[PDB]
């Protein structure tokens, strides 16, 4: 089976360059045109370029002409993209894709998040959202970099009524997020409500109880 | 790119605005689900990709190309993209995505307001949060008020994807200002407008 495995997430300052790899398996890697496609968070897809099976022929999208470079190494079965002069606009999830069947995008890699920002890595601050039929409570996960962040309640005991909103980028350049859960009002004195937030990029894990 | 709302088993017909008749018949359609890579459904205007059910179909000539879903299965709800391409020179241009969403009975939001925690005020920032729980349709308007003064530009909105169970949305709005400005005002309110609310709903608190 065709399988494309990309390298991990990257953090870059503006003006720097980045190089993502895409390792193929399960097929010869000598037949297929390959593509690079990117998608900014909450935005549409955007094609970047194509490479012929020998790797001697490429055609980039005009927006990235002169700043992107795509290469291929059959003996390692690896596909590469090199983007330079990075700006905040280049923050996106980048996908490698094989065109073995149609010449389009028939098989995809898992994708790689590339966050271009002057901000440095920073673990979240966490603040309670105190409850006043049904009651509401939550946690404010604020001032963290980069994405992503995962949140859980009572370390998996709570699921129903939980909502973990998408992160929003603040003007400071750090992300902020809120996670909320709906509960019956009677249980506010009889049940402990603890949000668990793990920021893998900083290896920060924080727990926060939410009393009234 | 207006979002489509329809119930399961209904028909939908997406159109793609070609430039210079695309070329020959080089239009393709991709489907993407949240957290997932796009999946090809149709290429060459009308021939299906491997593993794609017959309920998808493509057609068109000249500048007018179309993807029809003769009846939507529950798994067909996603964002759909048109892809125009050519070979000489190679080029591949995604169109804007069109979300297809599950239509549902109207449901009014439940509103909650959260004053800033004393934890956060110790750090000099004050974030007030307005929660809108389990509502449909997605269109909703949050309006912060501070001492009967309408606010703009000091809040950010966030919306969940449609829920797997009840197909509802949820919204959170965070009003953010310095601890100094937070203490200059007494009443904080968020006024909510929605199709399910006969009158706007206002949740509020007086600081301390």
């Amino acid at each position: 089976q065709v399988q494309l495995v990309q390298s991990g997430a990257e953090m870059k300052k503006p003006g720097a360059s980045v190089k993502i790899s895409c390792k193929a398996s399960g097929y010869t890697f000598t037949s297929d045109y390959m593509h690079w496609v990117r998608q900014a968070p909450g935005q549409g897809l955007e094609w970047m370029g194509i490479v012929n099976p020998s790797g001697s022929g490429t055609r980039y999208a005009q927006k990235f002409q002169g700043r992107v470079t795509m290469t291929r190494d059959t003996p390692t079965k690896t596909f590469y993209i090199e983007l330079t002069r990075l700006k905040s606009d280049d923050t996106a999830v980048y996908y490698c894709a094989s065109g073995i069947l149609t010449g389009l995008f028939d098989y995809w890699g898992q994708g790689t998040l590339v966050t271009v920002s002057s901000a440095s890595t920073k673990g979240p601050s966490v603040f309670p959202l105190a409850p006043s039929g049904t009651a509401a409570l939550g946690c404010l996960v604020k001032d963290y970099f980069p994405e992503p962040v995962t949140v859980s309640w009572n370390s998996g005991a709570l699921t129903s009524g939980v909502h973990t909103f998408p992160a929003v980028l603040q003007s400071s350049g750090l992300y902020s997020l809120s996670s909320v859960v709906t509960v019956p009002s009677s249980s506010l004195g009889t049940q402990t409500y603890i949000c668990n937030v793990n920021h893998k990029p900083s290896n920060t894990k924080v727990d926060k109880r939410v009393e009234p | 790119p207006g979002t489509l709302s329809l119930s399961a088993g209904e028909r939908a017909t997406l159109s793609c605005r070609a430039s210079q008749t695309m070329t020959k018949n080089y239009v393709a359609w991709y489907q993407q689900k949240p957290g997932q890579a796009p999946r090809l459904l149709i290429y060459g205007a009308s021939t299906r990709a491997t593993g794609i059910p017959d309920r998808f179909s493509g057609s068109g000539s000249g500048t007018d190309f179309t993807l029809t879903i003769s009846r939507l299965a529950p798994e067909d709800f996603a964002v759909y993209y048109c892809l125009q391409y050519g070979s000489s020179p190679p080029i591949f241009t995604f169109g804007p995505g069109t979300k297809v969403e599950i239509k549902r009975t109207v449901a009014a939001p439940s509103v909650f307001i959260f004053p800033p925690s004393d934890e956060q005020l110790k750090s000099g920032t004050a974030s007030v949060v307005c929660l809108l729980n389990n509502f449909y349709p997605r269109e909703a308007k949050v309006q912060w008020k501070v001492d009967n003064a309408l606010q703009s530009g000091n809040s950010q909105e966030s919306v969940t994807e449609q829920d797997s169970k009840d197909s509802t949305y949820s919204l959170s709005s965070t009003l953010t200002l310095s601890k100094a400005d937070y203490e200059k005002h007494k009443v904080y309110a968020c006024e909510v407008t929605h199709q399910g609310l006969s009158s706007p709903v206002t949740k509020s608190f007086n600081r301390g």
């Binding site: 045109y33 194509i50 012929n52 001697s56 022929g57 065109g99 069947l101 149609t102 010449g103 389009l104 | 080089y26 290429y43 060459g44 021939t47 391409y85 070979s87 000489s88 020179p89 190679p90």
Partner: peptide
């Protein structure tokens, strides 16, 4: 001939001649 092989043939013609 099927559409998938045909478009890859046209892509082969562009890169062979540039």
């Amino acid at each position: 001939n099927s559409t998938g092989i045909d478009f890859q043939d046209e892509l082969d013609e562009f890169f062979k001649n540039v």
